């Protein structure tokens, strides 16, 4: 089956150099594998995001030559799907309602103890937690090798729907990547630790687990003007050939050659650069 990858930005700001790295690396790996590359706007909580940011992000991708396949998926148009997934989990004996306060959880060290797991509380003024069976605590990264996660965090009956009504990231990412047919997730190293919880969720749904690559995080908005020197800097960051005389080429030519020359093994394995 065809490779399917994606870039899934949060519209809490515009793209910066760090998010360009994630977009570019996901794009290059997808195109090198003769695959599809999709874009999903994570506008799951629009009251806490910035009007106009999603549109800015899509325009920036186009400016840097990173054109996606198909239609953009919007998480603001997917709450029906998340609700459906929650209903299935509850019906299948895989979730429960938790009425514990923030203060209680804080007092026991910040990781839930499964207090409400067999209390059979109703949905009224409650969070929804997953009822883990066999938590995943390690995974394979195609760049970094085998990763060992924080065991206490990995084994928690984690929140999948918040008491304030927000759908949890870990729920929505699995439901949407599955819906879009994603076969490999190429993203930043800041998402390493939640990976094992997401894999646990794929297993509870009975769904095929994708492959994972976590790129190094670039640490301290993209220029509106000439994108070429910024693209060259991003290619260098990712350990790729970085054309000296970029002034003689278009963005499109630079990307076409970067796809031809893409070497995953040359990407740095540091968590942060
Ligand atoms: Zn509870």
PDB file of C-alpha atoms and ligand atoms in Angstrom:
ATOM      1  CA  UNK A   1       0.000   0.000   0.000  1.00  0.00           C
ATOM      2  CA  UNK A   2       1.115   3.549  -0.736  1.00  0.00           C
ATOM      3  CA  UNK A   3       3.032   5.450   1.943  1.00  0.00           C
ATOM      4  CA  UNK A   4       0.921   8.199   3.555  1.00  0.00           C
ATOM      5  CA  UNK A   5       2.527  10.879   5.752  1.00  0.00           C
ATOM      6  CA  UNK A   6       1.348  14.225   7.112  1.00  0.00           C
ATOM      7  CA  UNK A   7       2.081  17.588   8.702  1.00  0.00           C
ATOM      8  CA  UNK A   8      -0.352  18.538  11.534  1.00  0.00           C
ATOM      9  CA  UNK A   9       0.259  22.125  12.745  1.00  0.00           C
ATOM     10  CA  UNK A  10      -1.529  23.838  15.681  1.00  0.00           C
ATOM     11  CA  UNK A  11      -2.946  27.282  14.756  1.00  0.00           C
ATOM     12  CA  UNK A  12      -1.800  28.848  18.068  1.00  0.00           C
ATOM     13  CA  UNK A  13       0.708  30.877  16.030  1.00  0.00           C
ATOM     14  CA  UNK A  14       2.251  30.978  12.555  1.00  0.00           C
ATOM     15  CA  UNK A  15       5.012  28.656  11.355  1.00  0.00           C
ATOM     16  CA  UNK A  16       8.465  29.294  12.805  1.00  0.00           C
ATOM     17  CA  UNK A  17      11.810  27.636  12.019  1.00  0.00           C
ATOM     18  CA  UNK A  18      11.075  24.690  14.313  1.00  0.00           C
ATOM     19  CA  UNK A  19       7.741  23.844  12.664  1.00  0.00           C
ATOM     20  CA  UNK A  20       9.265  24.302   9.183  1.00  0.00           C
ATOM     21  CA  UNK A  21      11.762  21.535  10.102  1.00  0.00           C
ATOM     22  CA  UNK A  22       8.851  19.208  10.921  1.00  0.00           C
ATOM     23  CA  UNK A  23       6.990  20.140   7.721  1.00  0.00           C
ATOM     24  CA  UNK A  24      10.076  19.784   5.536  1.00  0.00           C
ATOM     25  CA  UNK A  25      11.246  16.490   7.003  1.00  0.00           C
ATOM     26  CA  UNK A  26       7.782  14.933   6.777  1.00  0.00           C
ATOM     27  CA  UNK A  27       7.485  16.184   3.168  1.00  0.00           C
ATOM     28  CA  UNK A  28      10.901  14.930   2.078  1.00  0.00           C
ATOM     29  CA  UNK A  29      10.461  11.471   3.579  1.00  0.00           C
ATOM     30  CA  UNK A  30       6.975  11.146   2.005  1.00  0.00           C
ATOM     31  CA  UNK A  31       8.115  12.262  -1.477  1.00  0.00           C
ATOM     32  CA  UNK A  32      11.294  10.107  -1.304  1.00  0.00           C
ATOM     33  CA  UNK A  33       9.022   7.112  -0.561  1.00  0.00           C
ATOM     34  CA  UNK A  34       6.782   7.998  -3.585  1.00  0.00           C
ATOM     35  CA  UNK A  35       3.944   8.616  -1.141  1.00  0.00           C
ATOM     36  CA  UNK A  36       1.159  11.027  -0.284  1.00  0.00           C
ATOM     37  CA  UNK A  37       1.748  13.981   2.036  1.00  0.00           C
ATOM     38  CA  UNK A  38      -1.318  15.440   3.750  1.00  0.00           C
ATOM     39  CA  UNK A  39      -1.974  18.526   5.909  1.00  0.00           C
ATOM     40  CA  UNK A  40      -4.267  18.528   8.984  1.00  0.00           C
ATOM     41  CA  UNK A  41      -5.022  21.743  10.903  1.00  0.00           C
ATOM     42  CA  UNK A  42      -5.225  20.939  14.620  1.00  0.00           C
ATOM     43  CA  UNK A  43      -7.942  23.585  15.282  1.00  0.00           C
ATOM     44  CA  UNK A  44      -9.516  21.373  17.930  1.00  0.00           C
ATOM     45  CA  UNK A  45     -10.075  24.219  20.485  1.00  0.00           C
ATOM     46  CA  UNK A  46     -10.784  27.403  18.408  1.00  0.00           C
ATOM     47  CA  UNK A  47     -11.519  29.662  21.431  1.00  0.00           C
ATOM     48  CA  UNK A  48      -7.850  29.053  22.510  1.00  0.00           C
ATOM     49  CA  UNK A  49      -6.298  29.497  19.034  1.00  0.00           C
ATOM     50  CA  UNK A  50      -5.695  32.573  16.861  1.00  0.00           C
ATOM     51  CA  UNK A  51      -8.144  33.751  14.163  1.00  0.00           C
ATOM     52  CA  UNK A  52      -6.278  33.748  10.822  1.00  0.00           C
ATOM     53  CA  UNK A  53      -3.346  31.581  11.935  1.00  0.00           C
ATOM     54  CA  UNK A  54      -4.481  28.442  10.044  1.00  0.00           C
ATOM     55  CA  UNK A  55      -4.745  30.385   6.795  1.00  0.00           C
ATOM     56  CA  UNK A  56      -1.319  31.980   7.386  1.00  0.00           C
ATOM     57  CA  UNK A  57       0.207  28.537   7.921  1.00  0.00           C
ATOM     58  CA  UNK A  58      -1.213  27.188   4.639  1.00  0.00           C
ATOM     59  CA  UNK A  59       0.097  30.224   2.744  1.00  0.00           C
ATOM     60  CA  UNK A  60       3.547  29.824   4.340  1.00  0.00           C
ATOM     61  CA  UNK A  61       3.713  26.168   3.268  1.00  0.00           C
ATOM     62  CA  UNK A  62       2.930  27.224  -0.296  1.00  0.00           C
ATOM     63  CA  UNK A  63       5.552  30.008  -0.131  1.00  0.00           C
ATOM     64  CA  UNK A  64       8.220  27.463   0.875  1.00  0.00           C
ATOM     65  CA  UNK A  65       7.155  25.105  -1.951  1.00  0.00           C
ATOM     66  CA  UNK A  66       5.560  22.448   0.306  1.00  0.00           C
ATOM     67  CA  UNK A  67       2.397  21.490  -1.592  1.00  0.00           C
ATOM     68  CA  UNK A  68       0.081  18.857  -0.103  1.00  0.00           C
ATOM     69  CA  UNK A  69      -2.116  16.197  -1.641  1.00  0.00           C
ATOM     70  CA  UNK A  70      -5.888  16.222  -1.356  1.00  0.00           C
ATOM     71  CA  UNK A  71      -7.966  18.449   0.899  1.00  0.00           C
ATOM     72  CA  UNK A  72      -6.842  19.891   4.205  1.00  0.00           C
ATOM     73  CA  UNK A  73      -8.583  18.171   7.167  1.00  0.00           C
ATOM     74  CA  UNK A  74      -9.747  20.491   9.978  1.00  0.00           C
ATOM     75  CA  UNK A  75     -10.084  19.110  13.550  1.00  0.00           C
ATOM     76  CA  UNK A  76     -12.795  21.762  14.181  1.00  0.00           C
ATOM     77  CA  UNK A  77     -14.859  19.743  11.685  1.00  0.00           C
ATOM     78  CA  UNK A  78     -14.143  16.401  13.425  1.00  0.00           C
ATOM     79  CA  UNK A  79     -15.771  16.616  16.899  1.00  0.00           C
ATOM     80  CA  UNK A  80     -18.461  14.223  15.638  1.00  0.00           C
ATOM     81  CA  UNK A  81     -15.763  11.617  14.941  1.00  0.00           C
ATOM     82  CA  UNK A  82     -14.198  12.076  18.382  1.00  0.00           C
ATOM     83  CA  UNK A  83     -17.628  11.705  20.033  1.00  0.00           C
ATOM     84  CA  UNK A  84     -18.224   8.492  18.058  1.00  0.00           C
ATOM     85  CA  UNK A  85     -14.855   7.067  19.184  1.00  0.00           C
ATOM     86  CA  UNK A  86     -15.609   7.937  22.829  1.00  0.00           C
ATOM     87  CA  UNK A  87     -18.977   6.178  22.576  1.00  0.00           C
ATOM     88  CA  UNK A  88     -17.357   3.034  21.171  1.00  0.00           C
ATOM     89  CA  UNK A  89     -14.731   2.955  23.949  1.00  0.00           C
ATOM     90  CA  UNK A  90     -17.354   3.298  26.669  1.00  0.00           C
ATOM     91  CA  UNK A  91     -19.639   0.652  25.155  1.00  0.00           C
ATOM     92  CA  UNK A  92     -16.685  -1.747  24.842  1.00  0.00           C
ATOM     93  CA  UNK A  93     -15.649  -1.493  28.528  1.00  0.00           C
ATOM     94  CA  UNK A  94     -12.549   0.575  27.714  1.00  0.00           C
ATOM     95  CA  UNK A  95     -13.260   3.903  29.491  1.00  0.00           C
ATOM     96  CA  UNK A  96     -14.766   5.348  32.669  1.00  0.00           C
ATOM     97  CA  UNK A  97     -15.903   8.651  34.204  1.00  0.00           C
ATOM     98  CA  UNK A  98     -13.610  10.304  36.783  1.00  0.00           C
ATOM     99  CA  UNK A  99     -14.863  12.930  39.258  1.00  0.00           C
ATOM    100  CA  UNK A 100     -11.513  13.500  40.983  1.00  0.00           C
ATOM    101  CA  UNK A 101     -10.366  17.087  41.485  1.00  0.00           C
ATOM    102  CA  UNK A 102      -7.173  18.633  40.208  1.00  0.00           C
ATOM    103  CA  UNK A 103      -6.155  19.089  43.870  1.00  0.00           C
ATOM    104  CA  UNK A 104      -6.533  15.362  44.615  1.00  0.00           C
ATOM    105  CA  UNK A 105      -4.366  14.322  41.642  1.00  0.00           C
ATOM    106  CA  UNK A 106      -1.757  16.975  42.526  1.00  0.00           C
ATOM    107  CA  UNK A 107      -1.615  15.666  46.144  1.00  0.00           C
ATOM    108  CA  UNK A 108      -0.666  12.129  45.076  1.00  0.00           C
ATOM    109  CA  UNK A 109       2.171  13.202  42.738  1.00  0.00           C
ATOM    110  CA  UNK A 110       0.375  14.239  39.558  1.00  0.00           C
ATOM    111  CA  UNK A 111      -0.184  10.762  38.038  1.00  0.00           C
ATOM    112  CA  UNK A 112      -3.636   9.207  38.418  1.00  0.00           C
ATOM    113  CA  UNK A 113      -4.096   6.086  40.569  1.00  0.00           C
ATOM    114  CA  UNK A 114      -7.203   4.619  38.931  1.00  0.00           C
ATOM    115  CA  UNK A 115      -9.524   5.705  41.803  1.00  0.00           C
ATOM    116  CA  UNK A 116     -12.704   5.818  39.662  1.00  0.00           C
ATOM    117  CA  UNK A 117     -11.896   2.641  37.615  1.00  0.00           C
ATOM    118  CA  UNK A 118     -14.635   0.467  39.223  1.00  0.00           C
ATOM    119  CA  UNK A 119     -16.865   3.129  40.826  1.00  0.00           C
ATOM    120  CA  UNK A 120     -19.199   3.367  37.803  1.00  0.00           C
ATOM    121  CA  UNK A 121     -19.788   7.168  38.082  1.00  0.00           C
ATOM    122  CA  UNK A 122     -21.986   8.782  35.424  1.00  0.00           C
ATOM    123  CA  UNK A 123     -20.918  11.426  32.887  1.00  0.00           C
ATOM    124  CA  UNK A 124     -22.171  14.386  35.004  1.00  0.00           C
ATOM    125  CA  UNK A 125     -19.324  16.820  35.764  1.00  0.00           C
ATOM    126  CA  UNK A 126     -16.680  14.193  34.996  1.00  0.00           C
ATOM    127  CA  UNK A 127     -13.619  13.611  32.839  1.00  0.00           C
ATOM    128  CA  UNK A 128     -13.298  10.465  30.701  1.00  0.00           C
ATOM    129  CA  UNK A 129     -10.250   8.250  31.250  1.00  0.00           C
ATOM    130  CA  UNK A 130      -9.050   5.286  29.195  1.00  0.00           C
ATOM    131  CA  UNK A 131      -9.089   1.919  31.009  1.00  0.00           C
ATOM    132  CA  UNK A 132      -5.712   0.535  30.027  1.00  0.00           C
ATOM    133  CA  UNK A 133      -5.257  -3.219  29.692  1.00  0.00           C
ATOM    134  CA  UNK A 134      -1.572  -3.692  28.804  1.00  0.00           C
ATOM    135  CA  UNK A 135       0.193  -0.293  28.602  1.00  0.00           C
ATOM    136  CA  UNK A 136       2.931   0.158  25.987  1.00  0.00           C
ATOM    137  CA  UNK A 137       6.186   1.442  27.524  1.00  0.00           C
ATOM    138  CA  UNK A 138       8.639   1.206  24.578  1.00  0.00           C
ATOM    139  CA  UNK A 139       8.474   1.809  20.810  1.00  0.00           C
ATOM    140  CA  UNK A 140      10.507   1.716  17.595  1.00  0.00           C
ATOM    141  CA  UNK A 141      11.578   4.998  16.000  1.00  0.00           C
ATOM    142  CA  UNK A 142      12.878   4.525  12.420  1.00  0.00           C
ATOM    143  CA  UNK A 143      15.556   7.200  13.003  1.00  0.00           C
ATOM    144  CA  UNK A 144      16.414   6.841  16.716  1.00  0.00           C
ATOM    145  CA  UNK A 145      15.933   3.105  17.330  1.00  0.00           C
ATOM    146  CA  UNK A 146      14.127   1.679  20.347  1.00  0.00           C
ATOM    147  CA  UNK A 147      12.904   4.272  22.853  1.00  0.00           C
ATOM    148  CA  UNK A 148      12.089   3.549  26.512  1.00  0.00           C
ATOM    149  CA  UNK A 149       9.310   5.782  27.826  1.00  0.00           C
ATOM    150  CA  UNK A 150       8.654   7.066  31.362  1.00  0.00           C
ATOM    151  CA  UNK A 151       6.936   3.980  32.855  1.00  0.00           C
ATOM    152  CA  UNK A 152       4.649   5.714  35.381  1.00  0.00           C
ATOM    153  CA  UNK A 153       3.336   8.146  32.778  1.00  0.00           C
ATOM    154  CA  UNK A 154       3.001   5.344  30.197  1.00  0.00           C
ATOM    155  CA  UNK A 155       0.858   3.197  32.540  1.00  0.00           C
ATOM    156  CA  UNK A 156      -1.628   5.901  33.628  1.00  0.00           C
ATOM    157  CA  UNK A 157      -5.341   5.662  32.850  1.00  0.00           C
ATOM    158  CA  UNK A 158      -4.898   8.943  30.992  1.00  0.00           C
ATOM    159  CA  UNK A 159      -7.549  11.556  30.142  1.00  0.00           C
ATOM    160  CA  UNK A 160      -9.257  11.196  26.750  1.00  0.00           C
ATOM    161  CA  UNK A 161     -12.003  13.821  27.300  1.00  0.00           C
ATOM    162  CA  UNK A 162     -11.444  16.667  29.714  1.00  0.00           C
ATOM    163  CA  UNK A 163     -13.897  17.705  32.433  1.00  0.00           C
ATOM    164  CA  UNK A 164     -14.115  21.155  30.799  1.00  0.00           C
ATOM    165  CA  UNK A 165     -15.276  19.485  27.546  1.00  0.00           C
ATOM    166  CA  UNK A 166     -12.117  19.626  25.414  1.00  0.00           C
ATOM    167  CA  UNK A 167     -11.182  16.468  23.450  1.00  0.00           C
ATOM    168  CA  UNK A 168      -7.706  15.213  24.332  1.00  0.00           C
ATOM    169  CA  UNK A 169      -4.846  15.433  21.851  1.00  0.00           C
ATOM    170  CA  UNK A 170      -3.946  11.757  22.314  1.00  0.00           C
ATOM    171  CA  UNK A 171      -7.487  10.713  21.305  1.00  0.00           C
ATOM    172  CA  UNK A 172      -7.834  13.059  18.342  1.00  0.00           C
ATOM    173  CA  UNK A 173      -4.420  12.325  16.776  1.00  0.00           C
ATOM    174  CA  UNK A 174      -5.086   8.549  16.702  1.00  0.00           C
ATOM    175  CA  UNK A 175      -8.651   8.881  15.400  1.00  0.00           C
ATOM    176  CA  UNK A 176      -7.600  11.305  12.639  1.00  0.00           C
ATOM    177  CA  UNK A 177      -4.355   9.615  11.538  1.00  0.00           C
ATOM    178  CA  UNK A 178      -6.340   6.361  11.268  1.00  0.00           C
ATOM    179  CA  UNK A 179      -9.153   8.103   9.323  1.00  0.00           C
ATOM    180  CA  UNK A 180      -6.651   9.628   6.847  1.00  0.00           C
ATOM    181  CA  UNK A 181      -4.814   6.297   6.335  1.00  0.00           C
ATOM    182  CA  UNK A 182      -1.502   7.567   7.739  1.00  0.00           C
ATOM    183  CA  UNK A 183       1.239   4.900   7.588  1.00  0.00           C
ATOM    184  CA  UNK A 184       4.179   6.873   9.040  1.00  0.00           C
ATOM    185  CA  UNK A 185       4.228   9.837  11.449  1.00  0.00           C
ATOM    186  CA  UNK A 186       7.241  12.137  11.029  1.00  0.00           C
ATOM    187  CA  UNK A 187       7.185  14.824  13.737  1.00  0.00           C
ATOM    188  CA  UNK A 188       9.274  16.691  16.316  1.00  0.00           C
ATOM    189  CA  UNK A 189      11.043  15.145  19.339  1.00  0.00           C
ATOM    190  CA  UNK A 190       8.784  17.042  21.716  1.00  0.00           C
ATOM    191  CA  UNK A 191       6.139  14.306  20.973  1.00  0.00           C
ATOM    192  CA  UNK A 192       8.327  11.301  21.892  1.00  0.00           C
ATOM    193  CA  UNK A 193       6.776  10.657  25.303  1.00  0.00           C
ATOM    194  CA  UNK A 194       3.073  10.721  24.315  1.00  0.00           C
ATOM    195  CA  UNK A 195       3.842   8.205  21.501  1.00  0.00           C
ATOM    196  CA  UNK A 196       3.496   5.173  23.767  1.00  0.00           C
ATOM    197  CA  UNK A 197       0.053   6.305  25.007  1.00  0.00           C
ATOM    198  CA  UNK A 198      -1.067   6.794  21.381  1.00  0.00           C
ATOM    199  CA  UNK A 199       0.174   3.293  20.452  1.00  0.00           C
ATOM    200  CA  UNK A 200      -1.734   1.891  23.464  1.00  0.00           C
ATOM    201  CA  UNK A 201      -4.867   3.576  22.069  1.00  0.00           C
ATOM    202  CA  UNK A 202      -4.349   2.140  18.513  1.00  0.00           C
ATOM    203  CA  UNK A 203      -4.148  -1.307  20.154  1.00  0.00           C
ATOM    204  CA  UNK A 204      -7.347  -0.804  22.174  1.00  0.00           C
ATOM    205  CA  UNK A 205      -9.223   0.273  18.987  1.00  0.00           C
ATOM    206  CA  UNK A 206      -7.851  -2.795  17.117  1.00  0.00           C
ATOM    207  CA  UNK A 207      -6.109  -0.623  14.516  1.00  0.00           C
ATOM    208  CA  UNK A 208      -2.791  -0.947  12.620  1.00  0.00           C
ATOM    209  CA  UNK A 209      -0.009   0.963  14.392  1.00  0.00           C
ATOM    210  CA  UNK A 210       1.940   3.343  12.091  1.00  0.00           C
ATOM    211  CA  UNK A 211       5.725   3.818  11.925  1.00  0.00           C
ATOM    212  CA  UNK A 212       7.318   6.783  13.758  1.00  0.00           C
ATOM    213  CA  UNK A 213      10.221   9.190  13.128  1.00  0.00           C
ATOM    214  CA  UNK A 214      11.004  11.949  15.642  1.00  0.00           C
ATOM    215  CA  UNK A 215      13.134  14.744  14.194  1.00  0.00           C
ATOM    216  CA  UNK A 216      15.423  16.927  16.326  1.00  0.00           C
ATOM    217  CA  UNK A 217      13.733  20.029  17.798  1.00  0.00           C
ATOM    218  CA  UNK A 218      15.102  23.418  16.674  1.00  0.00           C
ATOM    219  CA  UNK A 219      15.243  25.736  19.698  1.00  0.00           C
ATOM    220  CA  UNK A 220      15.918  29.509  19.866  1.00  0.00           C
ATOM    221  CA  UNK A 221       7.854  33.634  12.458  1.00  0.00           C
ATOM    222  CA  UNK A 222       9.208  32.570   9.048  1.00  0.00           C
ATOM    223  CA  UNK A 223      10.374  35.429   6.779  1.00  0.00           C
ATOM    224  CA  UNK A 224       7.808  36.858   4.330  1.00  0.00           C
ATOM    225  CA  UNK A 225      10.513  37.554   1.733  1.00  0.00           C
ATOM    226  CA  UNK A 226      12.992  35.220  -0.002  1.00  0.00           C
ATOM    227  CA  UNK A 227      12.378  31.718   1.418  1.00  0.00           C
ATOM    228  CA  UNK A 228      15.463  30.109  -0.179  1.00  0.00           C
ATOM    229  CA  UNK A 229      18.154  30.811   2.476  1.00  0.00           C
ATOM    230  CA  UNK A 230      15.711  29.633   5.179  1.00  0.00           C
ATOM    231  CA  UNK A 231      15.028  26.380   3.264  1.00  0.00           C
ATOM    232  CA  UNK A 232      18.780  25.825   2.829  1.00  0.00           C
ATOM    233  CA  UNK A 233      19.291  26.371   6.601  1.00  0.00           C
ATOM    234  CA  UNK A 234      16.516  23.834   7.332  1.00  0.00           C
ATOM    235  CA  UNK A 235      18.115  21.257   4.987  1.00  0.00           C
ATOM    236  CA  UNK A 236      21.446  21.753   6.791  1.00  0.00           C
ATOM    237  CA  UNK A 237      19.689  21.346  10.165  1.00  0.00           C
ATOM    238  CA  UNK A 238      18.369  17.990   8.931  1.00  0.00           C
ATOM    239  CA  UNK A 239      21.884  16.875   7.893  1.00  0.00           C
ATOM    240  CA  UNK A 240      21.134  17.111   4.165  1.00  0.00           C
ATOM    241  CA  UNK A 241      23.186  18.558   1.309  1.00  0.00           C
ATOM    242  CA  UNK A 242      22.838  22.346   1.487  1.00  0.00           C
ATOM    243  CA  UNK A 243      23.345  24.101  -1.866  1.00  0.00           C
ATOM    244  CA  UNK A 244      25.919  26.912  -1.796  1.00  0.00           C
ATOM    245  CA  UNK A 245      24.631  28.960  -4.728  1.00  0.00           C
ATOM    246  CA  UNK A 246      20.920  28.928  -3.902  1.00  0.00           C
ATOM    247  CA  UNK A 247      20.485  32.241  -5.777  1.00  0.00           C
ATOM    248  CA  UNK A 248      20.725  30.309  -9.105  1.00  0.00           C
ATOM    249  CA  UNK A 249      17.726  28.057  -8.320  1.00  0.00           C
ATOM    250  CA  UNK A 250      14.027  28.311  -7.504  1.00  0.00           C
ATOM    251  CA  UNK A 251      12.493  26.896  -4.311  1.00  0.00           C
ATOM    252  CA  UNK A 252      10.960  24.166  -6.466  1.00  0.00           C
ATOM    253  CA  UNK A 253      14.352  23.131  -7.897  1.00  0.00           C
ATOM    254  CA  UNK A 254      15.942  23.100  -4.441  1.00  0.00           C
ATOM    255  CA  UNK A 255      13.166  20.805  -3.123  1.00  0.00           C
ATOM    256  CA  UNK A 256      13.279  18.466  -6.138  1.00  0.00           C
ATOM    257  CA  UNK A 257      16.975  17.904  -5.559  1.00  0.00           C
ATOM    258  CA  UNK A 258      16.432  17.521  -1.786  1.00  0.00           C
ATOM    259  CA  UNK A 259      13.916  14.719  -2.459  1.00  0.00           C
ATOM    260  CA  UNK A 260      16.443  12.960  -4.764  1.00  0.00           C
ATOM    261  CA  UNK A 261      19.187  13.355  -2.140  1.00  0.00           C
ATOM    262  CA  UNK A 262      17.109  12.624   0.983  1.00  0.00           C
ATOM    263  CA  UNK A 263      18.996  10.447   3.487  1.00  0.00           C
ATOM    264  CA  UNK A 264      17.130   9.684   6.721  1.00  0.00           C
ATOM    265  CA  UNK A 265      20.297   8.265   8.342  1.00  0.00           C
ATOM    266  CA  UNK A 266      21.992  11.687   7.980  1.00  0.00           C
ATOM    267  CA  UNK A 267      19.393  13.399  10.214  1.00  0.00           C
ATOM    268  CA  UNK A 268      20.854  14.196  13.689  1.00  0.00           C
ATOM    269  CA  UNK A 269      19.623  11.948  16.521  1.00  0.00           C
ATOM    270  CA  UNK A 270      19.844  14.621  19.248  1.00  0.00           C
ATOM    271  CA  UNK A 271      16.490  15.465  20.868  1.00  0.00           C
ATOM    272  CA  UNK A 272      17.278  19.192  20.742  1.00  0.00           C
ATOM    273  CA  UNK A 273      19.578  21.373  18.626  1.00  0.00           C
TER     274      UNK A 273
HETATM  275 ZN1  LIG B   1     -11.222   9.690  39.559  1.00  0.00          ZN
END
